[PDB]
Write a protein that binds this ligand. Sequence first.
Ligand SMILES: OCc1nc2ncc(Br)cc2[nH]1
Length: 167
Amino acid sequence: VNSFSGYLKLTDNVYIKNADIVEEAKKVKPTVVVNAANVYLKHGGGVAGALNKATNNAMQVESDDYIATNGPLKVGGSCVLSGHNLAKHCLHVVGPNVNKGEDIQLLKSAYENFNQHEVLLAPLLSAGIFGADPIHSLRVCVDTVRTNVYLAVFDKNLYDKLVSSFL
Ligand SMILES: OCc1nc2ncc(Br)cc2[nH]1
């Protein structure tokens, strides 16, 4: 039993809600919140900009130190950093950005990072400003993630379409 509330169950391990991931993180304080990161951990907009803003820029400060030490992530890769006031940990996951020409096949590799954590609150990777079809992202999520994932979808219209079209 966990504290996530109001999710629709899609499969044995995948759940979904029409919610702002920031507000959902602040309320649940999950062990792991997933950020829709880019390789530079520059949290400017989309989900990353919103998460970082909610940490009063502390996420960005931590991220800049991480990059200065380690260099950029790989597309499809991830790193675990602090969750600040939102969660115990933040799993920064880089899905391919379609508006950068990156191979959508890397979406499965991106979701594989979720399997290193027993429970996660997450957005749909590569959705929104990353330019991929959120319906396809949900399909890859369900077919790749085996751990317990709670998906927050900001847009109600999108949330309703994802549910109604789910196979
Ligand atoms: O909590 C305020 C907020 N702003 C946001 N912008 C984009 C996304 Br996705 C989620 C957001 N949550």
